[PDB]
Amino acid sequence: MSKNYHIAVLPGDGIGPEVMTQALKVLDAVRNRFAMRITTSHYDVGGAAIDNHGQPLPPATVEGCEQADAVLFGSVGGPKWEHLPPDQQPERGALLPLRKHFKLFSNLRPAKLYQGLEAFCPLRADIAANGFDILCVRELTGGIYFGQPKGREGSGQYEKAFDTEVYHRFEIERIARIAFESARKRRHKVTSIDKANVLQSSILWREIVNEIATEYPDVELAHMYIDNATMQLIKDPSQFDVLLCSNLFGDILSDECAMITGSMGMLPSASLNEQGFGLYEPAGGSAPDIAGKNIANPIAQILSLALLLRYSLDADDAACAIERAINRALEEGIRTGDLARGAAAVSTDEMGDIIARYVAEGV
Amino acid sequence: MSKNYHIAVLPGDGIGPEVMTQALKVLDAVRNRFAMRITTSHYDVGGAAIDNHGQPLPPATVEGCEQADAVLFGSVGGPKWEHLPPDQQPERGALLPLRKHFKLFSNLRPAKLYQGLEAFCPLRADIAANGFDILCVRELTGGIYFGQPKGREGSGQYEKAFDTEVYHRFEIERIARIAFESARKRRHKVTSIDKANVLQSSILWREIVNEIATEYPDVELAHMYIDNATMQLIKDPSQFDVLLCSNLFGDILSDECAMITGSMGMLPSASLNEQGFGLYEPAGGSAPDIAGKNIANPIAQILSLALLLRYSLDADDAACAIERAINRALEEGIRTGDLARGAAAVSTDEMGDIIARYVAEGV
C-alpha cells in the first residue's frame, strides 16, 4: 500500500489484450482501495510486434521493461506467425530473451484449491475437502537440462548418450532464498525436495539449504525425496506450503500440483530475479480459437497481477484482496464456461467487472 | 499339461514364513489344477541364516538359487539383527548380492485397483470406478544412480556437485524387450517415459525404443514425458498398460502408482534378467512387531507367486487364476487386517486356505 510503482504491460496476441483488460480493471480497483500509486506503460511483443516493428521482441520494449518494477505479460502467438522459427518466434523470440535478459532464475507456481471447485479436483472428495495451497518454487537455469557435458558418443552396442546434473553453490543459495522469503509471505514452512540418498548434487543442495535456513529461524524446513513427494501430493496435499526444487524435480512437481487443483487453465506463474523484478503471466496457454469473442477466462491473468503485487511491489494485503474476490466469484458459481448449468453466468468483460467490483468491496 | 520346473523358496524373517506358507498352499492348487510339475526347495536367508549358519546369504542358499528356475523370496530383517555392518547382514548382506549375482537388471511393479478396495484409492470416485491395471517396468542397473563421474569439487561460489546420466544402447535394448514382452501378456500397450525435449540420454532412449517397437508390431507404443505421466496417472490411470521407465523415472513413477492403489501393503515385485530368471517378493518388508503366525496379510506374497508363474514359468493361465481368486476374496470383503467390524478378521492361515480354495475352484 504505497507510492512509486511502474509496470510494463505486454498483452501480446490472441486472448492476450482482452484478458489484460480485465487485469487493468482490477488494478484500478486496487489503485483506489489501497491508495497505491502504480503507473503502467504498454508495449508490443510477439505477434503484434512482428506486425509493427517486424520483431518478436522490439528493442524499445526491452528498454521499457528495464525501466519498470515488473512486467505483466499476456499471451504470445494467437493469429498467424511462426512459419519462420524458432528464435524468430513470439514464444521463443520474446519470452526466453526476457528471461535471459533479466536473470530470471526462479519460477513460482501456486496451486490452491478454490472453494467452488472442490468437485473438479481429482483427489478423493474427503481429501479435496481438506483443501490445499502450495507454492512450488522451481530453479530455472541450472541442473540437468543445461548441464555440461551433454551429448552422444560411439556406435553399436556401446553407443551412449549422457547429460550431466550439475549445481553450483551460487545457484542453490539464490533459489533457496526466494523459497524462504516466500514462506515468510505465507505459512512459514519450506519442503526442500531432493534425491539425497543417491545423488551427489542432491547432497550439496541439502547441505546448502541447511546453511541458508539458519538465516530464517522463523521458517520451518523439512527435506523430502522426489518419489515420496510424488505420493504425498496425492495422499495429503495439505501438509505443504512452499516446495523448494531443482530444475527437473520442480518441472515434475509443479505439474503434479496443477493437476490436483482440477482447474489448471486458471493458474498464474511468476519468474523472479534476486532483486525482486519479476515477469508475471498465466501458465495456461495462448488463445487462439477462443480469441476475440469474450469467453476467455481472465482469472489466471488477474491472478498473475496478485502475484505481481505480493512479490515485486510488496503489497501482500492488496494481493489477498484480489485472491478473496476470485474465491468469492468461484463459490457463487460465476464462470466464463467452467459451470453453465443455467448459463456460464459471465463473459470475459463481465468477469472482469465482477472481480473489480468485489475488490472495491461493492458486492 | 506338464512342466519340468523348480523353485527356490527363501521365506526370510518375520512374517516371511507365515505368508510364504500361504503362497505354497496356492502353488499346490495350481500344481493340481493345471497339471504342472513344480519342485520347491527351501533355503535359509538373512536373519534365519545368520542364526542357523552364521551369515545372511550362505554359499548353500546361493548354490540352491543357481539350481532353480526362479526364487520366491519372503521378507528379511528384524531388529534383532543388523547392529553390525551395512552390506554384511540381513538386508544388504542378503538381498543385493543376490541381485548382483543373478544379473537382475529389470524391476516389475504391478499396481492394480482391486474392486473390493476401491474406497482406499485416493482418487475421486468416478476415476476410481473406471479402475486401472498398470505394470511399471524400471531399469535398475544404469542411468543416473550409477553414472560416472559423480562427485563434488571446489570452494566458494562455483563449488559444484554432479551426477552423470548415462545409458548405452545395450542397456535400453534389454529393458525395452522385457517391457514389450510384458505388454504381450497384458493389454498390448507400452508407454515409454522420457524427457526427450531436453535430455540427450532421453533422446537415445526414445530412438532405441522405436527400433525395438518394430519387432513387436502387435504392441502399440506411445511416448510421454515424465511430467505429463505424473499428471495422467492422476487424471486417467486407466489409459495405461505397461510403463517402460529409466532408473530414476521408474523409481518416481513406481511410487506414484503404488499410492494410487491405496493398498500398498498388497503389492508384489519382480526383478528379472535376460534369460528370464526372476527374484519375486513382496514390495514391502517383514513386520517383526506383527511376526507371530497369524495376522500378516499374505496377498502380496501370493501375488508374487502369480508373477513368477507368468514371467519365469510362462504359465499366465495359472497366474490369472490366482489373480481371479484374490479378486473374488477381496470383493467378498474377506480380508486379514484391512477391515473388521463384524469380527471380520480372518487369519493369515484362513486367507491362504480360502484363496487356495477358489483356485481349486470355488464350489
UniProtKB/Swiss-Prot annotation, chains A, B:
Note describing how the cofactor binds: Binds 1 Mg(2+) or Mn(2+) ion per subunit.
Location of the protein in the cell: Cytoplasm
Amino-acid positions noted as binding substrate in the UniProt annotation, renumbered to this chain: R99, R109, R138, D227
Site positions (Important for catalysis): Y145, K195
Metabolic or biological pathway: Amino-acid biosynthesis; L-leucine biosynthesis; L-leucine from 3-methyl-2-oxobutanoate: step 3/4
Pfam family, one: Iso_dh
Main location: cytoplasm
Biological process (GO), any one: L-leucine biosynthetic process
List of residues binding Mg(2+): D227, D251, D255
pH dependence per the entry: Optimum pH is 7.6.
UniProt KW keywords: Amino-acid biosynthesis, Branched-chain amino acid biosynthesis, Cytoplasm, Leucine biosynthesis, Magnesium, Manganese, Metal-binding, NAD, Oxidoreductase
The protein's Enzyme Commission number: 1.1.1.85
Catalytic activity: (2R,3S)-3-isopropylmalate + NAD(+) = 4-methyl-2-oxopentanoate + CO2 + NADH
Record note on temperature dependence: Optimum temperature is 70 degrees Celsius.
Database matches in InterPro entries: IsoCit/isopropylmalate_DH_CS, IsoPropMal-DH-like_dom, Isopropylmalate_DH
Gene Ontology terms: cellular component: cytosol
Assembly and oligomerization: Homodimer.
Described function: Catalyzes the oxidation of 3-carboxy-2-hydroxy-4-methylpentanoate (3-isopropylmalate) to 3-carboxy-4-methyl-2-oxopentanoate. The product decarboxylates to 4-methyl-2 oxopentanoate.
Family: Belongs to the isocitrate and isopropylmalate dehydrogenases family. LeuB type 1 subfamily.
PANTHER family per UniProt: 3-ISOPROPYLMALATE DEHYDROGENASE
Name listed for the protein in its UniProt record: 3-isopropylmalate dehydrogenase
Organism: Escherichia coli (strain K12)
